[PDB]
């Protein structure tokens, strides 16, 4: 008929550059195919991003789609945890896929 065998991850939607203002919501998307369903991790400037799934205390959520949802962009005079260049990595037992960069910039 048409079987789906296990296969390693492939990014089918890369995050895209985003311009946002302080206090506004933002999403960076990351759709990966793979079986078993790949798990998604986010990195900002090469450093792993903490989300509700690593800390329940958060303005950042990792949604079941793999998307990184910012309920509100934090950008104070002297505190800027959200602006940066992001990559998502999708993993399953057969391999991993790394997305293109996406810049999250505050206007």
């Amino acid at each position: 008929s048409l079987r789906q065998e296990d296969f390693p991850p492939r990014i089918v939607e890369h995050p895209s550059d985003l311009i946002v203002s302080k206090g506004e919501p933002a999403t960076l998307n990351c759709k990966a195919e793979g079986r078993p369903t790949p798990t998604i991790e986010w990195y900002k400037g090469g450093e792993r991003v903490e989300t509700d799934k690593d800390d329940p205390r958060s303005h950042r959520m990792l949604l079941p789609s793999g998307s990184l949802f910012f309920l509100r962009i934090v950008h104070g005079r002297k505190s800027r945890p959200d602006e940066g260049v992001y990559v998502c990595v999708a993993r399953n037992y057969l391999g991993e896929a790394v997305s293109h960069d996406a810049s999250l910039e505050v206007a």
Partner: protein, 210 residues
């Protein structure tokens, strides 16, 4: 078949991506097999009668960052597979009766960053599988008792950046939030003076008085 992919969009494996294309209306005549429609960052003002009803395999509708001020009550009528509806960053002031009727499968509903000034007690009547509800950054002064009763699967809620009046009519919410510690954004009273700037979750229920 004939062509069912709008030229402004790309259609890949039933995902239709129309983001950031300066669209003022939802493209019509999409593939009947569509599972995801991505319309974020356009200039759509109105969601017309039965807009999404034909697309029975839709799992995800993203309309974030448009200019939506009006949605037809039957815009999502007859969708039984819809998993995620994202509407944040629009200009929505009210949700008509029946807007979310029949969305039994819905798991994610992002309504944050609008101008919603009132919610109907039946607004989420059928949303028994909803896991995340975001109402953050709207114009709600109250939520009617019973509005959250249908939300049997709810895990996370955002209610903050709403000008709540923490009187007797919001007492149920203090109770609700003490029994269900699922509100993560820090919902706060705007009035009365005694409760101004205090998290609803931090206030003893007795203090909610008319």
């Amino acid at each position: 078949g004939s062509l069912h992919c709008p030229a402004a969009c790309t259609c890949s494996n039933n995902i239709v991506d129309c983001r950031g294309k300066g669209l003022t209306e939802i493209p019509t005549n999409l593939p009947e097999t569509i599972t995801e429609i991505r319309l974020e960052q356009n200039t759509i003002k109105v969601i017309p009668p039965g807009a999404f009803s034909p697309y029975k395999k839709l799992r995800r509708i993203d309309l974030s960052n448009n200019q939506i001020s009006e949605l037809a009550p039957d815009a999502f009528q007859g969708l039984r597979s819809l998993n995620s509806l994202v509407l944040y960053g629009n200009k929505i002031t009210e949700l008509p009766k029946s807007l979310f009727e029949g969305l039994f499968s819905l798991q994610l509903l992002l309504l944050n960053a609008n101008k919603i000034n009132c919610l109907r007690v039946d607004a989420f009547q059928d949303l028994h599988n909803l896991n995340l509800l975001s109402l953050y950054d709207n114009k709600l002064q109250t939520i009617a008792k019973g509005t959250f009763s249908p939300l049997r699967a709810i895990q996370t809620m955002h209610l903050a950046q709403n000008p709540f009046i923490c009187d007797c009519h919001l007492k149920w919410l203090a109770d609700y939030l003490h029994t269900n510690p699922i509100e993560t954004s820090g919902a706060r009273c705007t009035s009365p003076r005694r409760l101004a700037n205090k998290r609803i979750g931090q206030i003893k229920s007795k203090k909610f008085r008319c």
